[PDB]
Amino acid sequence: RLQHHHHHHHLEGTVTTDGADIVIKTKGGLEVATTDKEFSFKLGGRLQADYSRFDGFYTKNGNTADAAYFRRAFIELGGTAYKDWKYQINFDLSHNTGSSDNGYFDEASVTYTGFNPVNLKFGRFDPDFGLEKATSSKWVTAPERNAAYELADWINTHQDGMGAQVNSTLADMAYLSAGVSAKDADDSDGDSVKQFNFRGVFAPMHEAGNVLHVGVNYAYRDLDDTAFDSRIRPRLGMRGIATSGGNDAGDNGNRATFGGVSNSPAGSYKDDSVWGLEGAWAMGPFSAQAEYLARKLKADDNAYKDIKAKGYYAQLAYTLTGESRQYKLEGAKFDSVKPENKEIGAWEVFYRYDNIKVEDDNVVADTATREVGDTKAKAHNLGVNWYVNDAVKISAAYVKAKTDKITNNNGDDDGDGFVTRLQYVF
């Protein structure tokens, strides 16, 4: 018996909703929201495709290595329900963020905004320490963030745990955020490392092309009875020396240990503190920003000595085509450049100088590549960003690093690299 049915006529062409009026938008992804602000959804993401070549100190033998990888490949889902409840889930397909055991999350958070301007944020999200870190990874001026953060990257990374943060703008001239987090490392009882963060910024001028910003950061974590990796291992602006998400320098990459050890035993260190300062000034297309931080990792057991590190960076940026870097008091952070000329886009030049010093008195004998005393590095990052349009940014940068009391296997105390990136935001 063959199948059959009466012919149906279908009404065609309209798009409607059964609830509150909806506005839908696309700039390459999708946004849908009710006009009464009760409900919304946004699907987006970011692709950062990098190719780099580098030599000298950046590699073990000093010869040129390369890397061809996605720095980030986020899929981003966020939304609002019942006006005051937001979520944001950003997962990194490149596997550079998060982990196999715990999920490749850049963020998985829920925010209650009912106390606006005060927000309450929960879940897995990087703690707020530092201006360059607060700035979206889409819009950080240099291809990689500064080396001073590499002295204590726990201060502003989620480390596969959970946290709770309160934040607010204040008096139309300031921003404060404070939070507690549990990080993914246990003491001998299976109790996680607990961490406190504070950030406070005074930014009396806080708009694109008109920024005056000074801030303070503090981070503390309790390492009592906890085995942990104390290594400071800066990449000094060259991600490709060691990275997920594609090809890297492999066995010839030199992500060097400037201090600390991979397995510091339970009981070796008691706690770990970092203070930071931020400054920024912007007038139209010109901006200057800088940060300084200092870490003290405090020994517990007498066989161990404190480890200290200090670092800073300063950056100048200028949009040759005249546009301002966006700036938001909510988060006290820079953001994108929006090109005014549709035919040629926006062109931005930048220079960042980084300087770090590691004081690890536990290093008591020379190795083949590392001398007793304070290890140091300086880096220079000079480059161009072409904002083709709001979605696409193409970048090229030259990076140079110079070190003290540490070399590669070739004896190099400096190295050079070039990195190019194609970024697509949707």
Ligand X SMILES: CCCCCCCCOCCOCCOCCOCCO
Binders of a copy of itself among residues 315 to 344 (CB under 8 A) are 343-344
- For a copy of itself (CB under 8 A), the number of binding residues is 106
- Separation between Cα atoms, residue 245 and residue 228, nearest integer Å: 25
Write the binding mask 373 to 392 for a copy of itself: x where contact by CB under 8 A, - elsewhere.
---------------xxxxx
Residues from 224 through 263 that contact a copy of itself (CB under 8 A): 244-253
Partner whose footprint covers residue 384, from a copy of itself, ligand X, none (CB < 5 to 8 Å by kind): ligand X
Residues that bind ligand X (CB under 6 A): 49-51, 122-123, 162-164, 384, 386, 394-396, 420-422
DSSP state of 251: G
Pick what 302 binds: ligand X, a copy of itself, none; C-beta below 5 to 8 Å, kind-dependent: none
Q: Which is nearer to ligand X, 64 or 420 (CB)?
A: 420
Of the two residues 43 and 212, which places its CB atom closer to a copy of itself in the complex?
A: 43
Q: How far, in Å, CA of 43 to CA of 48, rounded?
A: 17
Stretch that binds a copy of itself, among 1-9, 133-141, 231-239, 321-329 (CB under 8 A): 1-9
Task: Tell me the closest approach of the beta carbon of residue 105 to ligand X, in angstroms.
Answer: 12
CA neighbor of 185 nearest in space, from 199, 195, 197: 195
Q: Could you say which of a copy of itself, ligand X, none residue 192 binds, taking C-beta under 5 to 8 angstroms by partner kind?
A: a copy of itself
CA-nearest of 349, 327, 342 to 389 is: 342
Count CB neighbours of 416 within 10 A.
17
Rounded least distance, CB 127 to ligand X, Å: 12
- Buried (b) or exposed (e) across 76-99, using 16+ Cβ within 10 A? bebbbeeeeebbbbbbbebbbbbe
User: Considering only residues 264-323, where is the footprint of a copy of itself by CB under 8 A?
Assistant: none
The C-alpha atoms of residue 226 and residue 231 are separated, in whole angstroms, by 15
How many whole angstroms separate alpha carbon 417 and alpha carbon 379?
11
Stretch that binds a copy of itself, among 93-101, 131-139, 143-151, 289-297 (CB under 8 A): 93-101
Q: How far apart are CA 287 and CA 281, in angstroms?
A: 6
Q: Which of ligand X, a copy of itself, none interacts with 373 (beta carbon under 5 to 8 A by kind)?
A: none
318 bridge partner residues: 286, 349
* 421 interacts with, out of a copy of itself, ligand X, none, CB within 5 to 8 A per kind: ligand X
151 DSSP 8-state letter? G
Contact 234, 355 (CB under 8 A): no
By beta-carbon proximity to ligand X, the closer residue of 195 and 257 is: 195
Does the footprint of a copy of itself cover residue 91 (CB under 8 A)? yes
18-21: long-range contacts, CB 8 A cutoff, minimum separation 24: none
Q: Give me the least distance between CB of 218 and a copy of itself, in Å please.
A: 22
Binding partner of residue 116 among a copy of itself, ligand X, none, CB under 5 to 8 Å per kind? none
